[PDB]
Amino acid sequence: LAEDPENLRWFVQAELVNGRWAMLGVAGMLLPEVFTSIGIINVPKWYAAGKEEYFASSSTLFVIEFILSHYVEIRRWQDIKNPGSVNQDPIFKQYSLPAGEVGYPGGIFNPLNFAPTLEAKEKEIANGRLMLAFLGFIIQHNVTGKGPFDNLLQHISDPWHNTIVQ
């Protein structure tokens, strides 16, 4: 007998998790542009600490890392079904405990709210999308090239290039 727009919690979240990890995603780039120098795929190995002991390996620099993340990630699941995270800023966003205009079922279109301080994650909405779709762009044009813009000598007009494989 259930009709239309339901979901409640759901993937309103997903967006604000994608964009905030798309924002902090392009923060991966950023660096190699004003003073260009080091970039592309890099296989970075990140930034690297001191010159004492390491040499290419010293074991997996991430698998040991992500066990920690784990039981600090299922904690949003330790949240999304039954709300709980003192700050309370994604599940519905802040302002304390409001947005129950969608927490107890019955959305339909609901835009929402949040931040005792002035406005909202609202013009921190756009900045969510532009970054989720920017990656789109960012890892779209690798497969062919890796640098952005110069001036009017012989770059910003596109001369001759190789196309896709075939």
Partner 1 sequence: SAPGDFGFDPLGLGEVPANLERYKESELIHCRWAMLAVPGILVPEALGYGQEWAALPGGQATYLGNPVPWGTLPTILAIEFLAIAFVEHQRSMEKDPEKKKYPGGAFDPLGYSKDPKKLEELKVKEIKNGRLALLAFVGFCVQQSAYPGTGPLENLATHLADPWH
CA dist., res. 4 & res. 82, Å (int): 23
Given 9, 17, 115, 124, the residue binding ligand CLA (CB under 6 A): 17
Q: Using alpha carbons, list the distances in angstroms from residue 139 to 17, 81, 85.
A: 19, 34, 34
Q: Which does residue 84 touch among ligand CLA, partner 1, none (CB within 5 to 8 A, set by kind)?
A: ligand CLA
Does residue 147 belong to the site contacting ligand CLA (CB under 6 A)?
no
Does residue 13 belong to the site contacting ligand CLA (CB under 6 A)?
yes
Q: Which is nearer to partner 1, 48 or 64 (CB)?
A: 64
Q: Which does residue 81 touch among ligand CLA, partner 1, none (CB within 5 to 8 A, set by kind)?
A: ligand CLA
Does residue 53 belong to the site contacting partner 1 (CB under 8 A)?
yes
CA dist., res. 77 & res. 83, Å (int): 9
Residues in CB range of 75: below 8 A, 6 or more apart: 85
Single out the residue of 126, 74, 70, 115 nearest to residue 92, CA to CA: 115
Amino acid identity of residue 80, one-letter, is I
Q: Which is nearer to ligand CLA, 76 or 155 (CB)?
A: 76
**Are the beta carbons of 127 and 133 closer than 8 angstroms?**
no
Binding site for ligand CLA (CB under 6 A): 13-14, 17-18, 21, 24, 27-28, 31, 44, 46-47, 70, 73-74, 76-79, 81-82, 84, 136, 140
